[PDB]
Amino acid sequence: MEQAPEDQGPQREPYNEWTLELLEELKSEAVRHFPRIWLHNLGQHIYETYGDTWAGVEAIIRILQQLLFIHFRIGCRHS
């Protein structure tokens, strides 16, 4: 008898805008910890393979948040 609570949290209805409110922010911290060499090259590598189709737009927010988590987990203070 556990009642999972009602999801009245912060919703994200403009998903085409909330991404744009945060995809800059995903770029606004990776440049503060990493050189822009990998940032443009991985962004080009997905754009040659996912393009302007939202399947690289969320997917870069996948890969950037997957690295910025583990790069703040392995034990580098910035990188």
């Binding site: 556990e2 999801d7 919703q11 927010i61 996948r62 997957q66 910025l68």
Partner: protein, 116 residues
């Protein structure tokens, strides 16, 4: 001292107190935490590959509050194995996640989001 065998402790606890001898419960914990078996694996079949970061159980042990790379925690029934209620928690990710014992509160900490 309680005997090293388990059946020799089992015959001895029938005519002796709780565990069988001096340091009897220690041997009962050697045989019982030296073996494990995977029951269920909980994937994240939305974008075909899982992105979990942090794990914990609930305060009633029915759900287990996993935590994605994207910053949302997703409930899962331990019996069913079904997504039940996602929650748009954080922007960055989920680093730490613990509940309270009364089941009223929940602490989650993020990776780089402006509220941490």
């Amino acid at each position: 001292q309680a005997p090293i065998n388990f059946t020799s402790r089992l015959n001895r606890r029938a005519s002796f107190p709780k565990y069988g001898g001096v340091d009897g419960g220690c041997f009962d914990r050697h045989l019982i935490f030296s073996r494990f078996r995977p029951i269920s694996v909980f994937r994240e079949a939305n974008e075909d590959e899982s992105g979990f970061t942090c794990c914990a159980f609930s305060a009633r042990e029915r759900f287990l509050m996993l935590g994605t790379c994207t910053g949302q925690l997703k409930l899962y029934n331990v019996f069913s194995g079904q997504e039940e209620a996602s929650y748009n928690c954080h922007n960055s990710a989920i680093t730490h996640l613990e509940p309270s014992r009364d089941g009223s509160l929940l602490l989650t900490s993020a990776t780089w989001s402006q509220p941490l």
